[PDB]
Symmetry: D2
Subunit: 98 residues, 4 copies
């Protein structure tokens, strides 16, 4: 049936295993402030809430993007515009919520 999504799973799985614990924790908050597949992130709000520096938000972000799971864009000014490219991602995230 399932058109072997696996590949998309694998990718996500990989992406995740590379995150640090702080980066992982940062990710669950980031993708919950999201409105489904695309949205806007203000890193300060996340940073303030979780008690970590924007670097870890930023880095978490890069790691994901470099694995091609997301794509993200400078809205200079206010936040950063995030778009999920991989359907299986939010499952895993939503899954292992701890």
């Amino acid at each position: 049936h399932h058109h072997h999504h696996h590949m998309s799973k694998a990718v996500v799985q990989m992406a995740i295993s590379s995150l640090s614990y702080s980066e992982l924790e940062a990710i669950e908050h980031i993708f919950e402030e999201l409105d489904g597949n695309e949205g806007l992130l203000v890193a300060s709000k996340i940073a303030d809430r979780v008690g970590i520096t924007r670097s870890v938000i930023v880095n978490a972000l890069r790691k994901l993007e470099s694995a091609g799971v997301i794509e993200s864009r400078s809205l200079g000014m206010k936040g950063t515009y995030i778009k999920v490219l991989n359907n299986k991602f939010l499952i895993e995230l939503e899954n292992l919520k701890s």
Copy 2:
């Protein structure tokens, strides 16, 4: 903590398998226990109805992924050891 790389490795490995190759290990591994044991690809081809080659390179792939090991014995069988903790569970639910 680290068990994601391992999941990844499994999904990576299992996702490079041809559809018929997936089917074939599906059965190799329903030939139970869950660590080690053996068969011959003759006895599963003349049995499930899939040629003895798809068995042989389905294996060759899991083994290239590091997911398993196999001393192919001296012709009288082919010994399989799952050396990847998580292959076990991650297999089960498959298509």
Copy 3:
């Protein structure tokens, strides 16, 4: 320096290892009819040339897309519009040309 591209490499590497030999061979031709990063593919021309059916072209294609290396779009009519999303891909391709 290199902002750990690795992840993008890994992804590509993975994508590749899943292709069949015919699918691999099909890929080198597809991505050479390309004009750099994006372009247009007519699968029949490829099929005719390499002597394989459109299914393998199509499948090769899916595998890549599902690993998020490319994205591809129905131009119904004429060809299929292909876009490379991963910078490290064409290196590997261009690399292992055989």
Copy 4:
């Protein structure tokens, strides 16, 4: 043919390493040969200038990827075997 999954596995593994973790195995593995041997993470921390923990979980990751194995001995060392053919070359050129 199949040696791509293996490359993949290596790039996968090595890409999950922290920058300092990469640096640390860089040296663990310049402590040469190219299959097996040992050290202690005490003797490389009080040596290269990186703490003994980054050594320990850099290892834990390569080993979760299946790239290596380690019986951590009985405190008097820590035995390392690269069990992945291609880790060898793929390491070399690193950042």
